[PDB]
Amino acid sequence: ELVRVEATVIEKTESWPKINMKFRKRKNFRKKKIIVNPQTILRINTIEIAPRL
Amino acid sequence: VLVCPPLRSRAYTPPSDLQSRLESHIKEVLGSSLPNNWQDISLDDGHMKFRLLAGLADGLGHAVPNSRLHQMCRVRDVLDFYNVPVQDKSKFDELVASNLPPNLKISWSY
Amino acid sequence: EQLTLSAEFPVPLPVLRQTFFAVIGALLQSSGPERAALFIRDFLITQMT
Amino acid sequence: DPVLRKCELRIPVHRRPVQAWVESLRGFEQERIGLAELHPDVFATAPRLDIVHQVAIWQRNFRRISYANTKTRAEVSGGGRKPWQQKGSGRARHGSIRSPLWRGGGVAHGPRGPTSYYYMLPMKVRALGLKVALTVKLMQDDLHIVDSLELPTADPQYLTELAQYRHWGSSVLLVDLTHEEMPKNVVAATSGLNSFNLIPAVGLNVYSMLKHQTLVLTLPSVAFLEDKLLWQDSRYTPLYPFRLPYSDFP
Amino acid sequence: TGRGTSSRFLTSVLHNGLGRYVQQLQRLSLSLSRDAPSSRGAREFVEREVTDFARRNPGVVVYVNPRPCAMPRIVAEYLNGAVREENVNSKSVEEIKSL
Amino acid sequence: VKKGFRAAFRFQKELERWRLLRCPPPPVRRSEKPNWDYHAEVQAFGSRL
Ligand SMILES: [Mg+2]
Ligand SMILES: [Mg+2]
Ligand SMILES: [Mg+2]
Ligand SMILES: [Mg+2]
């Protein structure tokens, strides 16, 4: 009852490429992985309170 | 010094009077006054099959492909095959004349 | 800017500004005052955040 | 007068025959002049494309001879002596200026001499491939049985227009029974065309059928092809080469 | 790689969510070949999914250009002025639709 | 001289990139560039908002 918070979805995207390269003898430059994750952005709109304490 | 008739289209639509034209040919070929059970008359005879199918192609303009002849066992099959339309329109051609939304634009560069 | 018709590109700022308000004027005639007031709030009043 | 043909050989009882329109080339509109029956075991075999793959590759590879060659360290000019002594110089140890490591030396693992790629597929397998190819053309409506190859005129243009008229492909392969008796009119018209090719019946092969869009067979050749292929079924193994005299075989 | 690349702060184009949300994508271009195995999947996408996508998103203008082509390609342009380009060589309908 | 044209084709693309950086092209209005229909663009402008 006390508090209401509302938000909006603005963008749905992916992260920039992240390099993961495990430490191993004979590492080499091609024993490498690229990780990209999905992302979303929210904008907070309003915060409201009511006299019900 | 021969001459060549102009090329035709390959589109065929079942004529409305299919039954009348089909049976009329059958009576003429059979010459037996449309015996009952006409739909199930066997076409195994070679001479009968040629006369019926050859005449129909010339008049209607549509002929059975070489692949489908062996399937024409009975007069019903000939009746069934002729009632399906054939259209040469491309899948793209149908798309263009299909009431496209206002934000979609197409152009043919070929 | 993309839809503007003018003799110089890039469009000069005084020309660009004029066409912007003309669009609001066209919106006013078509849909009336209440709609345009929401238009100004959304796009101009936001710039003072 | 319909032209009606029946298979000379015995069709299996459980299999119904298949048919095609007989045609003639004497005019632009003589599309249908007859009706013909074709042995189901030839023109209605199962659609096996793996076998078609094998026979096409056999034809291309069994003739191949490659003439690529390289010299080994033994065959390059010079190189006999040891360049310098093992110790003292401070260079790498070496024993000839023509080893693979050196500029101008021999090749370690290169092509060697003329090499052949010969092999033979079993005779029954090669015969089966021909049946499958003939079946494919019929089922896809690319085969046209004709009574004879006689033509009204020898002008090459006439033949091309006829193909356009009847919805044929850009490339056409024409088969006749024997080379010696082929009609004069056909020979003159085809000889000047790149894409229209005339061959005798004995020259039919899987590879040419794939290359050419539409196949044209005269009726005498149809009986010819039916006889040879069906013989491969219901035969013994050879006691000795078939060219030698046999009781019932030509 | 962080020290080898640029960075920025989180932002929005024109305060997108404050008053009203506006879709940034405004134009798509797709090029095809009539008869080429590489572009088969793109052809099916036009046959099935192109019209439905246009209706759900009415603020995007879509251009489809069949022409002799070696690689089918898609170009996307945005209101802020960015341009992005993607190859669609020999991809399935599902891959293109999700992209 | 190696056999093949694909490497030569690729390198032409990079020469294009280098030339652009050194000599940036003058701006042009989008109307001149391909894939433009004025009527359709205007309608999407309204629906966008
Ligand atoms: Mg030596
Ligand atoms: Mg010695
Ligand atoms: Mg030595
Ligand atoms: Mg050498």
From Swiss-Prot, chain A:
The gene is Mrpl21. This is Large ribosomal subunit protein bL21m. The chain holds residues 156 to 208 of 209 of the full protein. It is found in: Mitochondrion. Component of the mitochondrial ribosome large subunit (39S) which comprises a 16S rRNA and about 50 distinct proteins. It comes from Mus musculus. Belongs to the bacterial ribosomal protein bL21 family.
From Swiss-Prot, chain B:
Disulfide bonds: none annotated. It comes from the Eukaryota. One of its GO terms (biological process) is mitochondrial translation. Keywords: Mitochondrion, Ribonucleoprotein, Ribosomal protein. Transmembrane segments: none annotated. Signal peptide: none annotated. Its main location: mitochondrion. GO terms for cellular component: cytosol; mitochondrial inner membrane; mitochondrial large ribosomal subunit; mitochondrion. It is found in: Mitochondrion. Belongs to the mitochondrion-specific ribosomal protein mL50 family. Component of the mitochondrial ribosome large subunit (39S) which comprises a 16S rRNA and about 50 distinct proteins. This is Large ribosomal subunit protein mL50. It comes from Mus musculus (Mouse).
Swiss-Prot record, chain C:
It comes from the Eukaryota. The chain holds residues 176 to 224 of 333 of the full protein. Transmembrane segments: none annotated. Belongs to the ribonuclease III family. Mitochondrion-specific ribosomal protein mL44 subfamily. Component of the mitochondrial ribosome large subunit (39S) which comprises a 16S rRNA and about 50 distinct proteins. This is Large ribosomal subunit protein mL44. It is found in: Mitochondrion. Component of the 39S subunit of mitochondrial ribosome. May have a function in the assembly/stability of nascent mitochondrial polypeptides exiting the ribosome.
Swiss-Prot record, chain D:
GO terms for molecular function: structural constituent of ribosome. The modification Omega-N-methylarginine is found at R103. Its main location: mitochondrion. It is found in: Mitochondrion. One of its GO terms (biological process) is mitochondrial translation. InterPro entries: Ribosomal_uL4 (IPR002136), Ribosomal_uL4-like (IPR013005), Ribosomal_uL4_dom_sf (IPR023574). Residues 75-95 are annotated as: Disordered. Gene3D superfamilies: 3.40.1370.10. GO terms for cellular component: mitochondrial inner membrane; mitochondrial large ribosomal subunit; mitochondrion. Keywords: Methylation, Mitochondrion, Ribonucleoprotein, Ribosomal protein. The keyword Mitochondrion applies. It holds the Pfam family Ribosomal_L4. The keyword Zinc-finger does not apply. Belongs to the universal ribosomal protein uL4 family. Component of the mitochondrial ribosome large subunit (39S) which comprises a 16S rRNA and about 50 distinct proteins. Interacts with MIEF1 upstream open reading frame protein. PANTHER family: 50S RIBOSOMAL PROTEIN L4, LARGE RIBOSOMAL SUBUNIT PROTEIN UL4M. This is Large ribosomal subunit protein uL4m. It comes from Mus musculus. The gene is Mrpl4.
